[PDB]
Design a protein that fits this description.
Blueprint: E1 5-10, H1 23-26, H2 30-38, E2 41-45, H3 61-70, H4 77-86, H5 94-106, E3 110-115, H6 125-137, E4 143-149, H7 159-173, E5 177-183, H8 184-187, H9 194-206, E6 211-212, H10 215-224, E7 235-237, E8 253-256, H11 265-272, E9 290-293, E10 304-305, H12 316-322, E11 327-332, H13 336-342, E12 354-359, H14 375-387, E13 393-398, H15 400-405, H16 410-433, E14 437-441, E15 466-470, E16 481-482, H17 486-494
Parallel strand pairs: 1-13, 1-14, 2-16, 3-4, 3-8, 4-5, 6-7, 8-9, 9-10, 11-12, 11-13
Antiparallel strand pairs: 2-15, 5-7, 14-15
Helix pairs in contact: 6-7, 7-10, 9-11, 14-16
Bound molecules: 2-phosphoglyceric acid (2PG) and manganese (II) ion (2 copies).
One manganese (II) ion is lined by residues 11-12, 61, 64, 402, 443-444.
Length: 509
């Protein structure tokens, strides 16, 4: 029957010479190793300008899957917004100004919330500073900040430095007050764990949660309990009289300064949806909010977008569809948005002929508790589909290296990589058995460095290059490639014409 071409993404799996804290290098990977030694291979740049990001900026699943599916260097939001600030266009943004005019004309308050760090994956604290400076320029009197603590795109216990700098900027600009602090685990969930979302929501709307007069004492107290940045319980900063600094009320305006959509949709829907059934927001939840999303999150969000989206035409999924091929997207919960929405160029709707399989990730708080996650279930489901001779193209993502690597724990991440290697062998061998070809690669690093040189947890991504193995004998792969060269390579193998929009180039010499 069909000789499928499968694009296999080992999420957060990069190549790094240094072996200290390197779960990728330390893991026993007999399958990956044999494919690497027996088939044509190379490495690709997955960071910085090569993927549409600022120089030196590490990649991530959004950036990576967008570039992989697009077959071209995809200009990223971080870069775009940084340039708007650099060129003096940020302050002229009609949406930001409308939000500020709203609060001034109706005598309400402006709330700013988002990830509080310079990680650059979901936000950048300098964008928050630009918004504070703009609010001051426009004469907005009441501005409240609801900080979402990081520890995932930066050090696990770095919140104090960001809070301190924010406090300095607030004093310098003469506007702003920190109202709440919440770990991104609660305020930025993407797994439909509504109990987590509700906690963040109630801290911001009802002033419910651990209370502190001093933001730094809130963090220190959490640390004393072994609860670091990412997991800080939604907390409420209170005034001298004990009342919350600020709760979100009717007719207020909100600017969510996150520019990556996957972790912003849930809390945004909670605030803007007329009909919300995931949980009872309470008869007195805020209504008539002027809600601003820094970038496009979802059509379901009743708000305004500051930096409008632009369609990515002729991405891999569209080309496959146009040529009448059947394609399958598959991954477990954690990377399902990436093999679907992001891979499709920032499009939720499936292309004609595109099927999707979602495998539920395990019900554990952190994945170091179950390194194998649901990889075996993903593999079992895919093997059945391959056996059925249904798909011409397959896009599979194994979330493990990345998801467990974010724990900053060496042994668990090694187990995650080894589990994925076992699954990789079954999938690739099955594909080869069908006369097909596999393109084994990754979207960015993570598991390659889960410990800092001093032995402490390294919970974020790395800037190391990703591997690429094409399981086809008799060919050679050129070096110096980028993520945007993968789609052209896949089309090359499928014998399909490459669209003009794909400025990337096939890796096959
Ligand atoms: O978990 C996330 O949202 C990011 C880190 O902020 O990681 P990844 O890009 O792998 O999804
Ligand atoms: Mn990833
Ligand atoms: Mn990651």
């Amino acid at each position: 029957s069909k000789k499928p071409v499968a694009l296999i993404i080992l999420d957060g799996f990069a190549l790094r010479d240094e072996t200290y804290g390197n779960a990728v290098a330390q893991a026993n990977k007999p399958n990956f190793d044999r494919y690497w030694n027996e088939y044509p291979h190379t490495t690709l740049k997955a960071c910085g300008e090569a993927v549409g990001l600022p120089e030196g900026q590490m990649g991530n699943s959004e950036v990576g899957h967008l570039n992989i599916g697009a077959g071209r260097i995809v200009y990223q939001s971080l870069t775009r917004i940084n340039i708007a600030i650099r060129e003096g266009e940020f302050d002229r943004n009609e949406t930001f100004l409308a939000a500020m005019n709203h609060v001034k004309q109706h005598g309400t308050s402006l709330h700013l919330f988002g990830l509080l760090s310079d990680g650059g994956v979901h936000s950048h604290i300098h964008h928050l500073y630009a918004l504070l400076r703009l609010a001051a320029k426009e004469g907005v009197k009441r501005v409240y900040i609801h900080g979402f603590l990081d520890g995932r795109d930066v050090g696990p216990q770095t919140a104090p430095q960001y809070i301190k700098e924010l406090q300095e900027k607030i004093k310098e600009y003469g506007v702003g007050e920190i109202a709440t602090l919440s770990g991104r685990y609660y305020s930025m969930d993407r797994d439909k764990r509504w109990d987590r979302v509700e906690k963040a929501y109630r801290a911001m709307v009802y002033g419910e949660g651990p209370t502190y007069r001093d933001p730094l004492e809130c963090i220190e107290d959490s640390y004393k309990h072994g609860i670091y940045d990412e997991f800080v319980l939604p907390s409420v900063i209170v005034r001298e009289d004990g009342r919350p600094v600020a709760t979100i009320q009717d007719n207020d305006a909100i600017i969510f300064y996150n520019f990556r959509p996957d972790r912003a949709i849930q809390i945004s829907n909670t605030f803007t949806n007329e009909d919300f059934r995931e949980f009872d927001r309470g008869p007195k939840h805020p209504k008539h909010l002027f809600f601003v999303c820094l970038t496009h999150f979802s059509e379901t969000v009743a708000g305004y977008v500051a930096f409008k989206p632009t369609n990515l035409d002729n991405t891999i999924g569209e080309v496959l569809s146009q040529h009448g091929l059947r394609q399958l997207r598959i991954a477990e919960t954690e990377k399902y948005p990436h093999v679907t929405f992001f891979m499709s160029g920032g499009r939720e709707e499936e292309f004609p002929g595109e099927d999707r399989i979602l495998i539920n990730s395990p019900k554990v708080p952190t994945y170091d508790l179950k390194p194998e996650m649901s990889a075996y279930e993903v593999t079992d489901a895919l093997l059945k589909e391959i056996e059925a001779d249904k798909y011409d193209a397959i896009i599979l993502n194994y979330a493990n290296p990345d998801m467990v690597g974010h724990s900053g724990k060496l042994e668990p991440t090694i187990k995650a990589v080894e589990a994925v290697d076992e699954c990789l062998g079954k999938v690739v061998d099955a594909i080869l058995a069908k006369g097909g070809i596999a393109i084994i690669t990754a979207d960015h690093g993570n598991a390659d460095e889960v410990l800092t040189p001093d032995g402490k947890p390294q919970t974020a991504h790395t800037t190391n290059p990703v591997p690429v193995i094409v399981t086809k004998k008799g060919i050679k792969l050129r070096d110096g490639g980028i993520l945007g060269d993968l789609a052209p390579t896949m089309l090359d193998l499928l014998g399909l014409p490459q669209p003009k929009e794909m400025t990337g180039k096939s890796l096959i010499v």
